[PDB]
Amino acid sequence: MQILLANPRGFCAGVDRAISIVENALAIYGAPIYVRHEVVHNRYVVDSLRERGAIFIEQISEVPDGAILIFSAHGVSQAVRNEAKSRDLTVFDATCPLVTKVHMEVARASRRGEESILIGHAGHPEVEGTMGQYSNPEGGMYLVESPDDVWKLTVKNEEKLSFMTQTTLSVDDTSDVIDALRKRFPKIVGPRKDDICYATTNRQEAVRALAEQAEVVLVVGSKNSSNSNRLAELAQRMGKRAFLIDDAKDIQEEWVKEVKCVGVTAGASAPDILVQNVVARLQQLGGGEAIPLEGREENIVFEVPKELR
Ligand SMILES: O=CCCCOP(=O)(O)OP(=O)(O)O
Ligand code: SF4
Q1: Do domains 12-96+299-309 and 97-196 have the same CATH topology?
Q2: Is 96 marked as binding a ligand?
Q3: Which residues bind (2E)-4-hydroxy-3-methylbut-2-enyl diphosphate?
Q4: SS3 track for the chain
């Protein structure tokens, strides 16, 4: 059995920064360090940081006065930022810069009172944080997930309308949604393509190349990772069996029995150790040396705030 490894895979620049923000805060200030939401949607990273003294909360009212608070990579609404601001907290912001970029545009549209449409998945913390940048009652902020959503949306003034996207979407599905928006609202303004980040685009492109070669694709990542789920979905849509797994213990032998070629990748929030252990388990089930596929080079790094070292 040939084990193939997707390239690029695993940590992106935002996730490396965000985890380093929490670890450095723990090292500089000691436990506890409060984090609003899982810093990244990975169970291994999250359990790890919990055992080291980070406490993960959903609301600022869970956080004691005087505490250090870090916002997760996904970002936070103005309401949350202000509730934190109004309380007695030292705040470090681990929001990915590439999320912050979208935030600034929704804020712009809000200040103008011009309506904005977000493409994204209801209930995801990044969507809550992005929708949460708009506050002007004179305009409006709308969520669409699909072409059918666009087909039913009415806005107040379609001569002044813009759109933004969640950073972790399916590149192909988002393209359908944008085509629908431009047909329904011919004057809508957006970025040249979308707000899907470099890391989501690359890892999708990588998993397409993997799925071309592999009968079975394992995507290392947690159930609540949006970008990880998009990798598994892409492979499955190409007619390959695909599984999203937290770690090597999730592997069922039937998945790989009599399979000549298995592919492995990882979501942007999955550490490389998890992938090494998955390969190790596939080697127990008959795999050889893991072969990495050639991939698009990534060279972006995002530094932690100077205050955190
Ligand atoms: O939210 C932007 C991406 C952050 C890193 O990946 P993670 O799996 O934690 O988040 P998700 O892909 O947004 O659900
Ligand atoms: S997946 Fe993209 S937007 Fe999200 S943390 Fe990583 S680089 Fe930033």
Answers
A1: no
A2: yes
A3: 41, 74, 124, 167, 225-227, 269
A4: CEEEECCCCCCCHHHHHHHHHHHHHHHHHCCCEEEECCCCCCHHHHHHHHHCCEEEECCHHHCCCCCEEEECCCCCCHHHHHHHHHCCCEEEECCCHHHHHHHHHHHHHHHHCCEEEEECCCCCHHHHHHHCCCCCCCCCEEEECCHHHHHHCCCCCCCCEEEEECCCCCHHHHHHHHHHHHHHCCCCECCCCCCCCHHHHHHHHHHHHHHHHCCEEEEECCCCCHHHHHHHHHHHHCCCEEEEECCHHHCCHHHHCCCCEEEEEECCCCCHHHHHHHHHHHHHCCCCCEEECCCCCCCCCCCCCHHHC
Residue list, ligand 1 pocket, CB within 6 Å? 14-15, 40-41, 73-74, 96, 99, 126, 167-168, 225-228, 267-269
Residue 95 alpha carbon to ligand 2 centre in Å: 9
- The class of domain 12-96+299-309 in CATH terms is alpha beta
CATH assignment of 1-11+197-298, given 3.90.420.10, 3.40.50.1820, 3.40.1010.20, 3.40.50.2000?
Answer: 3.40.1010.20
Q: Any idea where the domains of the chain sit in the sequence?
A: 1-11+197-298, 12-96+299-309, 97-196
CATH number given to 97-196? 3.40.1010.20
Q: Can you give the resolution of this entry in Å?
A: 1.8
